[PDB]
Amino acid sequence: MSWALEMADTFLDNMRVGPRTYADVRDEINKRGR
């Protein structure tokens, strides 16, 4: 149970103003590779 902590962690991890779309964030893993 806890206070939804396990979720709060993954939240601050991806707390980038929430998601917006997949075509965009996805194309980022193309020109921004390694």
From Swiss-Prot:
Binding to TAP1 subunit, annotated site positions: Y22
Molecular function GO labels: lipid binding; molecular sequestering activity; phospholipid binding; TAP binding
Signal peptide positions (record): none
Subcellular location: Host cytoplasm; Host nucleus
Claim: Calcium is one of the keywords in the record: no
Protein role: Plays a role in the inhibition of host immune response. Binds specifically to transporters associated with antigen processing (TAP), thereby blocking peptide-binding and translocation by TAP as well as subsequent loading of peptides onto MHC class I molecules. Empty MHC I molecules are retained in the endoplasmic reticulum and ultimately directed to proteasomal degradation. In consequence, infected cells are masked for immune recognition by cytotoxic T-lymphocytes.
Domain notes for this protein: The N-terminal active domain blocks peptide binding to and peptide transport by TAP.
Name of the protein in question: ICP47 protein
